[PDB]
Design a protein around this nucleic acid. Structure first.
Ligand SMILES: [Mg+2]
Ligand SMILES: [Mg+2]
Ligand SMILES: [Mg+2]
Ligand SMILES: [Mg+2]
Ligand SMILES: [Mg+2]
Ligand SMILES: [Mg+2]
Ligand SMILES: [Mg+2]
Ligand SMILES: [Mg+2]
Ligand SMILES: [Mg+2]
Ligand SMILES: [Mg+2]
Ligand SMILES: [Mg+2]
Ligand SMILES: [Mg+2]
Ligand SMILES: [Mg+2]
Ligand SMILES: [Mg+2]
Ligand SMILES: [Mg+2]
Ligand SMILES: [Mg+2]
Ligand SMILES: [Mg+2]
Ligand SMILES: [Mg+2]
Ligand SMILES: [Mg+2]
Ligand SMILES: [Mg+2]
Ligand SMILES: [Mg+2]
Ligand SMILES: [Mg+2]
Ligand SMILES: [Mg+2]
Ligand SMILES: [Mg+2]
Ligand SMILES: [Mg+2]
Ligand SMILES: [Mg+2]
Ligand SMILES: [Mg+2]
Ligand SMILES: [Mg+2]
Ligand SMILES: [Mg+2]
Ligand SMILES: [Mg+2]
Ligand SMILES: [Mg+2]
Ligand SMILES: [Mg+2]
Ligand SMILES: [Mg+2]
Ligand SMILES: [Mg+2]
Ligand SMILES: [Mg+2]
Ligand SMILES: [Mg+2]
Ligand SMILES: [Mg+2]
Ligand SMILES: [Mg+2]
Ligand SMILES: [Mg+2]
Ligand SMILES: [Mg+2]
Ligand SMILES: [Mg+2]
Ligand SMILES: [Mg+2]
Ligand SMILES: [Mg+2]
Ligand SMILES: [Mg+2]
Ligand SMILES: [Mg+2]
Ligand SMILES: [Mg+2]
Ligand SMILES: [Mg+2]
Ligand SMILES: [Mg+2]
Ligand SMILES: [Mg+2]
Ligand SMILES: [Mg+2]
Ligand SMILES: [Mg+2]
Ligand SMILES: [Mg+2]
Ligand SMILES: [Mg+2]
Ligand SMILES: [Mg+2]
Ligand SMILES: [Mg+2]
Ligand SMILES: [Mg+2]
Ligand SMILES: [Mg+2]
Ligand SMILES: [Mg+2]
Ligand SMILES: [Zn+2]
Lengths: 77, 97, 56, 135, 252, 91
RNA sequence: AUGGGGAAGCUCCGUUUCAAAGGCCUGAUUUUAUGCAGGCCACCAUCGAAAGGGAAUCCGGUUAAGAUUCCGGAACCUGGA
RNA sequence: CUUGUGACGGCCCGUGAAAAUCCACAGGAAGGAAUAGUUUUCAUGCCAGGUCGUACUGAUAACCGCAGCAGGUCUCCAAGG
RNA sequence: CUAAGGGUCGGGUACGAUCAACUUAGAACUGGUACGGACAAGGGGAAUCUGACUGUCUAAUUAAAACAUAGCAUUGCGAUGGUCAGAAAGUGAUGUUGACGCAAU
RNA sequence: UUACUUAUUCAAUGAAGCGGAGCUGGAAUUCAUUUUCCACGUUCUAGCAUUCAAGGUCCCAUUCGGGGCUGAUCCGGGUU
C-alpha cells in the first residue's frame, strides 16, 4: 500500500523482525525525453502493508542489493 | 437639535463611522463622543460602554435605528455607531451631551 | 461518517482553541465577551443596590 | 486614557489562549516589521489554579495551586481590556521582543513568569487574575 | 341497514390523526414551586412549524430547578415572540408578550393565549392561530377571574390559572382562499382523513338518512333532535334556528 | 414592459377560479412573498417560511408573525394595549 | 406480554398506564472467593424493514455448473491482548 | 447523452420519519516525574471473526391465471445515424 | 459561396499571434415544380343543451349532465364538552387536539 | 337552604418546598404598647450555574482520607 524514499528508513525495515519476504522489480523505463534507463523497486513485505522503495539510480541499485540482510528471503524479479 | 449638531460635526470636523473603527478610537483615546444607535445589540452596546469608560469617553445613546443614524451623518448607508474625534464648529461635547 | 470518527486521530476532531470541535470561534468570541461584561455588570448592580439600601 | 499600558489586564478573545486573562507587558502601539498591527506583548495564565479547600492539605494544596503560564504576542483586536491591573516589574526584562524567537528564550521567560505568578497567588495579591473566566 | 359514515369515524381506524410529523404536544411549564411564587426565565431557542398546525410552535428552554440540566418545553409561539427572546413564567412575573402569568396577576384588558381552564393543566383555551382571550373582571375573594373566549362565551376560571400574554402567531391563515381542490387535499393530508365529503343525499337509503329518492332531497326535516340516536344525527343537530344569519351577531 | 394589465403574480392561475378568487389571493400572495425590515438589524432581510414564520436573511433572527404578513393588525394593537396596561404597574 | 381494570367464559381493556418493576462502575478481600462501601442512572418489556437507518474488500484468474465467498495478490473493520 | 455533486432559486393554510450508533465539547473527580514517572485517540507488532441464505428462472415455457395461456406481475444498466 | 456570432496568451507606470466550435440569415447555380419526399404529424368554423374548470365511479354491457372540488351558507360544542366507538371497563376515536378548532348537514 | 372531609369523582408530579408559627425588614397610628396588614435572594445582553457547597465550627488522635453542625429558622409527616 505504501511508498518510501529515505533509503535509510528502508534498510531499517528490512531488519524489522516480522519481514520474512521481499521482492525486487526491474522495469525498462525512459529518461526525461529521449532514451531509457533501468528503474528498480525495493518491495518490503511488512506484516500489514507492503512498503516499496523506488531507486531510480541504476548505480545505487547495485550497492543496495548487497545491503539487503542475508537472511532476508528476497525474490529477484 | 441633536441631528442639527450632528450635521455640524459632519461638515466641519473629524469622525469615523461604524463599529470596528470606533474601537480603535476608544483604545487610542481619540474619541470625544461615541453615538450608539437604538437597535445595535446590547452586547455591541455594553462592549463599547466598557470600552468607553476605560478611556473616560462619554456615550450618547441615539434614540433611532441605525438606518436613520445613517441619514443623521448624511451618508446613504446605515451606521450603528459614530465616533467624534474632533467637534468642528459644533458644541455637542459641551452642551447636554 | 459518524462511525468513522472513531477511526481517526483526535486532532481530526477539533481545533486547538477552547470549545474546539463544539462551537465556531466567532460564537466563542461572543461568549467570552458577553460573559465578561455581564459578570462585570453583575458587580455594577451589586454595589449600586448596597448604595440604595444604605441610602434610602 | 491611552489605557493600553504596562498595567492593564486583558482577556484573550481569539486563538488557543482565548478565554484567559493576560497582563500587557509591553505595548508596541502601531507597527512591526513582522506583526504590521497594534500588538501587545502579554503574559497570561494558561492552566489556572484549581479551587482549594479546608479538606485540601499537605502537598495537595501545593499541587492544586500550580500554575502553567504563557507569554504571547497578540493583536490588540483580540484582547478585551479590563478595569483591573497588575504589576509588571518582575518580568519587564523577561518578556521582550528578543524573548520571542528562539524557543529556549521563551522557556526561561515563562519560568520567571511562573515563579512570579505563583508568588502573587500564594498570599492572594491580585485575586481576580487567578480565577477561570467561565463562558 | 348500513352504518352511516359519521358512526364509522368513532372506532378510529382510517380516521385517526396523521401524527407522524408533529413537533409534539404544545403545553405549558408544569406548575412548580418557581412559577407559583416567583418567576423563571427561558430562551425561545427556535420557533418552528408544527405539521398540521395553523400556528407555529416555539421551543423555550429553561433550567431545571432541582437538577443541573436543561429542560425544554413546547409552547405555541405568541405573535412577535422571537428567537433568543427571554420568557418569564409564574406569579411575580412581568407583563410582556411572551411571558406566562396567572390570570390573577394581570389587570383587566390583558390579552392572553393558551390559558388553563383549571390551574396546572398546562393550557387549554385559545390556542389556534390568531385566537386569544381577554380578561374582563376579577373577584378577589374566591380568587376567580372572568375571561371572554374566542367563541365569545364568557367563562369564569381560577386566578391561579395561567396564560401567555399575547395573541397566537399565524393570524389570517383562513383569509386566503383555498382555491383549488388539492390544497384542501394537502391541508387534510396532515390532519385526518376527513376529506373529501360526500353528500348524504347522494347516497342510497342504506347509506344515509338522506339517501335515495328519485330526485336528491332530504325528504324530512334536516334538524335532528338533541336526543337522537347514533345513526340519526345527520343534519343540523339540535339547531335552535336555521336560515341565513341576517343582521349582526356578537354576544351581548 | 409591464407584462400584465392586472393579474400580477396571479397570472399563473390562468383563467381558473374566477377573478374575485384570484384577486383575493393576489393580495395575500403579494403580502406573503415580499421582504421585510428586520427589527433587530434594520436590513430588509426578513422573508417568509410557512404559516406565519418570519426569519432574517443575515442576522438569522426569527419572529413569530401573521400567516401572510409579519405584523398582524390585531397584534400591533395588542402590543400597545400591553404597553398601556403595564405602564400602570410602575407609574 | 407484564402490576393492574373488565368479562359466566373462551377472553377484552391498558403499554408506563392508580406497580415496593431494575444495574453499571469500581471499591472493601489479601480467612477467599467475591460479601459490603459509596456515588451514580430511573431508561419499564418485546416483535415489526432482505427497497428505510447501518463497522469494514478490492482487481486478476479459475468451474460442465459457484464466486465482491474459491485461488492469487493487495486492503480494511471490529473484539481481545 | 447518462449519472452524480455543488452554489442558488421557485413552491405551500403541504415546509416534506425514528431509533440504534459514532464523535466532540463544558466539566475537573482523580492519577501522575528526576533518579526517574506518566502516555496506547501517533507508529509498528499478535490472536480472533460463529450461525443462516448463496444454483437457476424472473417470464408470449421455471410466478399467478385448471396449461409451456397473445392476460397479469416491483426494479437497475443502455451504442451509432 | 457571402456575412454575423467566440477562447488563449505576453504589452512602460492602436494592434498582434494562434486554437476550436454548429447556429442563423443572405445569395448564386440546379431538377420532369420536386423537396416535413419513408418515418413522424392538429381538421376548421358557427350555435343550443349541459357541468365552472383539473380530478372521480359502476373490475366484466352505463365515464355522463352523475361524485367530488374550491367557493357559499347553515348547525352543534369551552372539556363536568360536541359527535362517534365498546358486552363491559381504572375502555376508546377526533386529540401531539381547543373555536383562524373539532364534529354535522 | 350552605357549610364540612373522610366515601365517591377529576387534575398533576421521575408525589419538591404544603400547612401552621417565627426571625429580620417596612407600610402603618400608637390613646400603653403593638391593636394589625404587606412583604421576607434572580429582568439591558442567545454566556456560565452539576462532584453531600465554598466558608465558619466542632470531632478522628493527626496521613491521605473522613465525619457532624451550620451555610438552608421551628412545628405537623395531609404529595399538590
Ligand atoms: Mg484539527
Ligand atoms: Mg482543559
Ligand atoms: Mg468541614
Ligand atoms: Mg340491518
Ligand atoms: Mg343492505
Ligand atoms: Mg371496526
Ligand atoms: Mg394515534
Ligand atoms: Mg394552533
Ligand atoms: Mg378534520
Ligand atoms: Mg376519504
Ligand atoms: Mg361534498
Ligand atoms: Mg357537505
Ligand atoms: Mg345514487
Ligand atoms: Mg334509513
Ligand atoms: Mg328520519
Ligand atoms: Mg332522500
Ligand atoms: Mg337537494
Ligand atoms: Mg415582451
Ligand atoms: Mg419494524
Ligand atoms: Mg427488530
Ligand atoms: Mg435492513
Ligand atoms: Mg437497508
Ligand atoms: Mg472475477
Ligand atoms: Mg467448483
Ligand atoms: Mg465433466
Ligand atoms: Mg452464473
Ligand atoms: Mg482471498
Ligand atoms: Mg497478505
Ligand atoms: Mg484494535
Ligand atoms: Mg433513470
Ligand atoms: Mg425547507
Ligand atoms: Mg464529530
Ligand atoms: Mg491506534
Ligand atoms: Mg446467481
Ligand atoms: Mg425462461
Ligand atoms: Mg403467458
Ligand atoms: Mg442504448
Ligand atoms: Mg466566422
Ligand atoms: Mg480570432
Ligand atoms: Mg369540431
Ligand atoms: Mg337542444
Ligand atoms: Mg365536468
Ligand atoms: Mg390537464
Ligand atoms: Mg376531467
Ligand atoms: Mg362497466
Ligand atoms: Mg346486459
Ligand atoms: Mg371521461
Ligand atoms: Mg365503458
Ligand atoms: Mg355535483
Ligand atoms: Mg363545501
Ligand atoms: Mg355561486
Ligand atoms: Mg359555529
Ligand atoms: Mg364526551
Ligand atoms: Mg369526548
Ligand atoms: Mg372499573
Ligand atoms: Mg362514607
Ligand atoms: Mg406534587
Ligand atoms: Mg412553610
Ligand atoms: Zn436582521
Amino acid at each position: 500500500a505504501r511508498e518510501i524514499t529515505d533509503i535509510k528508513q528502508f534498510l531499517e525495515l528490512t531488519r524489522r523482525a516480522d519481514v520474512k519476504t521481499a521482492t525486487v522489480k526491474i522495469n525498462k523505463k525512459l529518461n526525461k525525453a529521449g532514451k531509457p534507463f533501468r528503474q528498480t523497486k525495493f518491495k518490503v513485505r511488512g506484516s500489514s502493508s507492503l512498503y516499496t522503495l523506488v531507486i531510480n539510480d541504476a548505480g545505487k541499485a547495485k550497492k543496495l542489493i548487497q545491503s539487503l540482510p542475508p537472511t532476508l528471503k528476497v525474490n529477484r524479479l | 437639535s441633536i441631528n442639527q449638531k450632528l450635521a455640524l460635526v459632519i461638515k466641519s470636523g473629524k469622525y469615523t463611522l461604524g463599529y470596528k473603527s470606533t474601537v480603535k478610537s476608544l483604545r487610542q483615546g481619540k474619541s470625544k463622543l461615541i453615538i450608539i444607535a437604538a437597535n445595535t445589540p446590547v452586547l455591541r452596546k455594553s462592549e463599547l460602554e466598557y470600552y468607553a469608560m476605560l478611556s473616560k469617553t462619554k456615550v450618547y445613546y441615539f434614540q433611532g435605528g441605525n438606518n436613520e443614524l445613517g441619514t443623521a451623518v448624511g451618508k446613504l448607508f446605515r451606521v450603528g455607531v459614530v465616533s467624534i474625534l474632533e467637534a468642528g464648529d459644533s458644541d455637542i461635547l459641551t452642551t447636554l451631551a | 461518517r459518524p462511525r468513522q470518527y472513531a477511526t481517526v486521530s483526535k486532532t481530526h476532531k477539533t481545533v486547538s482553541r477552547a470549545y474546539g470541535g463544539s462551537r465556531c470561534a466567532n460564537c466563542v468570541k461572543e461568549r467570552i465577551i458577553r460573559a465578561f461584561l455581564i459578570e462585570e455588570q453583575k458587580i455594577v448592580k451589586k454595589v449600586v443596590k448596597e448604595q440604595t439600601e444604605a441610602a434610602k | 486614557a491611552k489605557f493600553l499600558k504596562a498595567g492593564k489586564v486583558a482577556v484573550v478573545v481569539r486563538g488557543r489562549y482565548a478565554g484567559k486573562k493576560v497582563v500587557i507587558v509591553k505595548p508596541h502601539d502601531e507597527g512591526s516589521k513582522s506583526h504590521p498591527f497594534g500588538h501587545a506583548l502579554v503574559a497570561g495564565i494558561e492552566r489556572y489554579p484549581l479551587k482549594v479547600t479546608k479538606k485540601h492539605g499537605a502537598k495537595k494544596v501545593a499541587k492544586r495551586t500550580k500554575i502553567k503560564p504563557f507569554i504571547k504576542v497578540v493583536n490588540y483586536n483580540h484582547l478585551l481590556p479590563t478595569r483591573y491591573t497588575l504589576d509588571v516589574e518582575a518580568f519587564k526584562s523577561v518578556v521582550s521582543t528578543e524573548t520571542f524567537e528562539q524557543p529556549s528564550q521563551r522557556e526561561e521567560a515563562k519560568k520567571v513568569v511562573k515563579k512570579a505568578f505563583e508568588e502573587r497567588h500564594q498570599a492572594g495579591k491580585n485575586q481576580w487574575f487567578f480565577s477561570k473566566l467561565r463562558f | 341497514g348500513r352504518v352511516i359514515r359519521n358512526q364509522r369515524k368513532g372506532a378510529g381506524s382510517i380516521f385517526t390523526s396523521h401524527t407522524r410529523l408533529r413537533q409534539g404536544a404544545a403545553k405549558l411549564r408544569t406548575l412548580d414551586y418557581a412559577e407559583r411564587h416567583g418567576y423563571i426565565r427561558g430562551i425561545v431557542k427556535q420557533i418552528v412549524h408544527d405539521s398540521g398546525r395553523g400556528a407555529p410552535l416555539a421551543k423555550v428552554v429553561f433550567r431545571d430547578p432541582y437538577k443541573y440540566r436543561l429542560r425544554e418545553e413546547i409552547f405555541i409561539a405568541n405573535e412577535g415572540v422571537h428567537t433568543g427572546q427571554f420568557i418569564y413564567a409564574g406569579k411575580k412575573a412581568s407583563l410582556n408578550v411572551g411571558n406566562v402569568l396567572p390570570l390573577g396577576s394581570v389587570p383587566e384588558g390583558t390579552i392572553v393565549s393558551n390559558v388553563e381552564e383549571k390551574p396546572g393543566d398546562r393550557g387549554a383555551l385559545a390556542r389556534a392561530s390568531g385566537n386569544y382571550v381577554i380578561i374582563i373582571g376579577h373577584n378577589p375573594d374566591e380568587n376567580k377571574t372572568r375571561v371572554r373566549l374566542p367563541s365569545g362565551a364568557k367563562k369564569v376560571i381560577s386566578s391561579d390559572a395561567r396564560g401567555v400574554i399575547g395573541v397566537i402567531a399565524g393570524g389570517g391563515r383562513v383569509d386566503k382562499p383555498l382555491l383549488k381542490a388539492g390544497r384542501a387535499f394537502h391541508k387534510y393530508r396532515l390532519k385526518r382523513n376527513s376529506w373529501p365529503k360526500t353528500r348524504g343525499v347522494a347516497m342510497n337509503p342504506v347509506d344515509h338518512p338522506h339517501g335515495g329518492g328519485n330526485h336528491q332531497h332530504i325528504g324530512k326535516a334536516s334538524t335532528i333532535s338533541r336526543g337522537a340516536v347514533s345513526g340519526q344525527k345527520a343534519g343540523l343537530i339540535a339547531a335552535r334556528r336555521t336560515g341565513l344569519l341576517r343582521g349582526s351577531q356578537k354576544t351581548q | 414592459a409591464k407584462r400584465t394589465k392586472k393579474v400580477g403574480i396571479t397570472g399563473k392561475y390562468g383563467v381558473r377560479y374566477g377573478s374575485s378568487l384570484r384577486r383575493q389571493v393576489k393580495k395575500l400572495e403579494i403580502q406573503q412573498h415580499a421582504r421585510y425590515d428586520c427589527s433587530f438589524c434594520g436590513k430588509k432581510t426578513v422573508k417568509r417560511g410557512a404559516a406565519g414564520i418570519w426569519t432574517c436573511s443575515c442576522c438569522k433572527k426569527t419572529v413569530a408573525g401573521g400567516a401572510y404578513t409579519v405584523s398582524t393588525a390585531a397584534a400591533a394593537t395588542v402590543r400597545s394595549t400591553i404597553r398601556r396596561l403595564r405602564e400602570m404597574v410602575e407609574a
